[PDB]
Write an enzyme that holds these catalytic residues in place. Structure first.
Site, mmCIF file in Angstrom:
data_model
loop_
_atom_site.group_PDB
_atom_site.id
_atom_site.type_symbol
_atom_site.label_atom_id
_atom_site.label_comp_id
_atom_site.label_asym_id
_atom_site.label_seq_id
_atom_site.Cartn_x
_atom_site.Cartn_y
_atom_site.Cartn_z
ATOM 1 N N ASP A 36 -2.605 86.969 56.764
ATOM 2 C CA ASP A 36 -1.886 86.181 55.769
ATOM 3 C C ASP A 36 -2.693 85.030 55.183
ATOM 4 O OD1 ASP A 36 0.114 85.142 54.158
ATOM 5 O OD2 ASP A 36 1.357 84.373 55.820
ATOM 6 N N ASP A 232 -2.988 85.676 47.903
ATOM 7 C CA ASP A 232 -2.106 85.819 49.066
ATOM 8 C C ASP A 232 -1.904 87.252 49.552
ATOM 9 O OD1 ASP A 232 -0.191 85.430 51.066
ATOM 10 O OD2 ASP A 232 1.428 84.874 49.719
HETATM 11 C C1 3KO Z 1 4.785 84.516 50.865
HETATM 12 N N1 3KO Z 1 4.565 84.253 52.283
HETATM 13 C C2 3KO Z 1 3.366 84.373 52.957
HETATM 14 N N2 3KO Z 1 2.243 84.708 52.405
HETATM 15 N N3 3KO Z 1 3.581 84.068 54.276
HETATM 16 C C3 3KO Z 1 4.961 83.656 54.501
HETATM 17 C C4 3KO Z 1 5.047 82.180 54.878
HETATM 18 C C5 3KO Z 1 4.579 81.199 53.800
HETATM 19 C C6 3KO Z 1 4.443 79.776 54.313
HETATM 20 C C7 3KO Z 1 3.659 78.966 53.289
HETATM 21 C C8 3KO Z 1 3.450 77.531 53.753
HETATM 22 C C9 3KO Z 1 4.760 76.860 54.160
HETATM 23 C C10 3KO Z 1 5.621 77.694 55.103
HETATM 24 C C11 3KO Z 1 5.802 79.130 54.609
HETATM 25 C C12 3KO Z 1 5.636 84.493 55.599
HETATM 26 C C13 3KO Z 1 5.371 85.996 55.548
HETATM 27 C C14 3KO Z 1 5.817 86.721 56.802
HETATM 28 C C15 3KO Z 1 6.329 88.071 56.353
HETATM 29 N N4 3KO Z 1 6.540 87.941 54.925
HETATM 30 C C16 3KO Z 1 6.950 88.910 54.012
HETATM 31 O O1 3KO Z 1 7.340 88.642 52.880
HETATM 32 C C17 3KO Z 1 6.911 90.330 54.497
HETATM 33 C C18 3KO Z 1 5.665 91.128 54.124
HETATM 34 C C19 3KO Z 1 5.581 91.550 52.681
HETATM 35 C C20 3KO Z 1 4.111 91.812 52.431
HETATM 36 C C21 3KO Z 1 3.326 91.169 53.544
HETATM 37 C C22 3KO Z 1 4.317 90.563 54.512
HETATM 38 C C23 3KO Z 1 6.165 86.650 54.442
HETATM 39 C C24 3KO Z 1 5.572 83.856 53.135
HETATM 40 O O2 3KO Z 1 6.743 83.653 52.875
#
Ligand code: 3KO
Length: 387
Positions: A36, A232
């Site tokens: 991530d 991302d």
């Molecule tokens: C957009 N995004 C990320 N890149 N990471 C998080 C967290 C962000 C943080 C940013 C800083 C502040 C706190 C929150 C969490 C992930 C976990 C699973 N997630 C999915 O959407 C499922 C799948 C779909 C394709 C790959 C995963 C999202 C998120 O919401």
């Protein structure tokens, strides 16, 4: 140049995420971890959950250290909460090192774990500024670089199959590579072109021009980065700011107008299907995103095909897809479907992101993804959004 031990160390897909194997604790506990680049916490399932077949068991680790602090992370489409601690962490198909890193032991979550994703935690690779609860919680990559001789850079090759992979196939298939501490030249063709990391929080970049089949979208370039543009791997789609999304969809509809698609398709909700092998790739336009270059008044472009922005989904023997471009109210997000076209170098040491045509991008006999430059582009600093 060549990092054979790390090549092909990823599995997964754009819709559910790409993950790498990691071990935590002593003796090592093996877990699959989502790669991530859009977050900065190393957070793993640490209690039973219907969608987890394994989790981190702190009581079984002799090297576990309790930080005696909770962490609550609510986000738009979900939430995770846990207990902070540290432990010894390794990447089996990674650098041959073991580091002492922060771990958020997830005790409760909502719409975080995905049924059938095969991952049990997330590896937030972005900067401390966006770590939770605050920037004092050192991210995994910062710990890795501080404690070892690993260069301050990682690179990602996310490999979209170009067709749906069932439960068994997605487990058996190679989803790509995460090269920790280097650049592997077998993962790309042509040249790497670099864009500056505007600020170290998310991997923030600046888009200076957008084209749909060579046709300039002609918006004030600030609109493209309103309120930020990030790279991302933890987002499936190419997400665009409201006004940009509306203009881009109008232009993509106009280019593909020989076939009419329902509103639900353009909303990214409904699938579109064609008889096996007959997807009309040629009616859909290519999309070029011009990025600020490292040289003054210079830009370069990355070009993606409908084989990237049409995401393969199972329906029959039909070839089906969802439109993987969607609206955002939080800026541009260059998600996994965009990253699948390229080998992406997160050069933290030189505060820049590199792009090259991926050796595993899906294409046809007539068109390929491209990374090209240079282009003369003026007042690019004005494309960045402030406040
Ligand atoms: C957009 N995004 C990320 N890149 N990471 C998080 C967290 C962000 C943080 C940013 C800083 C502040 C706190 C929150 C969490 C992930 C976990 C699973 N997630 C999915 O959407 C499922 C799948 C779909 C394709 C790959 C995963 C999202 C998120 O919401």
């Amino acid at each position: 140049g060549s990092f054979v031990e790390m090549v092909d160390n990823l599995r997964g897909k754009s819709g559910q995420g790409y993950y790498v194997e990691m071990t935590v604790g002593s003796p090592p506990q093996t877990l699959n971890i989502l790669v991530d680049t859009g977050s900065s916490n190393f957070a793993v399932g640490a209690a039973p959950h219907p969608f987890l077949h394994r989790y981190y068991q702190r009581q079984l680790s002799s090297t576990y250290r309790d930080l005696r602090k909770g962490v609550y992370v609510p986000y738009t489409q979900g939430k995770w909460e846990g207990e902070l601690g540290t432990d010894l962490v390794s990447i089996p198909h990674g650098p041959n090192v073991t580091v002492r890193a922060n771990i958020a032991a997830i005790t409760e979550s909502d719409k975080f774990f995905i049924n059938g994703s095969n991952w049990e935690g997330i590896l937030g690779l972005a900067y401390a500024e966006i770590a939770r609860p605050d920037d004092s919680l050192e991210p995994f990559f910062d710990s890795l670089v501080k404690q070892t001789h690993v260069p301050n850079l990682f690179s990602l090759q996310l490999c979209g199959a170009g067709f749906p992979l069932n439960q068994s196939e997605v487990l058996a298939s190679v989803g790509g590579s995460m090269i920790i501490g280097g650049i592997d030249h077998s993962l790309y063709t042509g040249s790497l072109w670099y864009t500056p990391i505007r600020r170290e929080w998310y991997y923030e970049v600046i888009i200076v021009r957008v084209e749909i089949n060579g046709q300039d979208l002609k918006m004030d370039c600030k609109e493209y980065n309103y309120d930020k543009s990030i790279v991302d791997s933890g987002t499936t789609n190419l997400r665009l700011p409201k006004k940009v999304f509306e203009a881009a969809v109008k232009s993509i509809k106009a280019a593909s107008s020989t076939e009419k698609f329902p509103d639900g398709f353009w909303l990214g909700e409904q699938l579109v299907c064609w008889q096996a092998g007959t997807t009309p790739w040629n009616i859909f336009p290519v999309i070029s995103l011009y990025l600020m270059g490292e040289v003054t008044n210079q830009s370069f472009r990355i070009t993606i095909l409908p084989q990237q922005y049409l995401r393969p989904v199972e329906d029959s023997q039909d070839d089906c897809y969802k439109f993987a471009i969607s609206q955002s109210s939080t800026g541009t997000v260059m998600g996994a479907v965009i990253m699948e076209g390229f080998y992406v170098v997160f050069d933290r040491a030189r505060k820049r992101i590199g792009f090259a045509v991926s050796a595993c991008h899906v294409h046809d006999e007539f068109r390929t993804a491209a990374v090209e430059g240079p282009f003369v582009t003026l007042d690019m600093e004005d494309c960045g959004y402030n406040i």
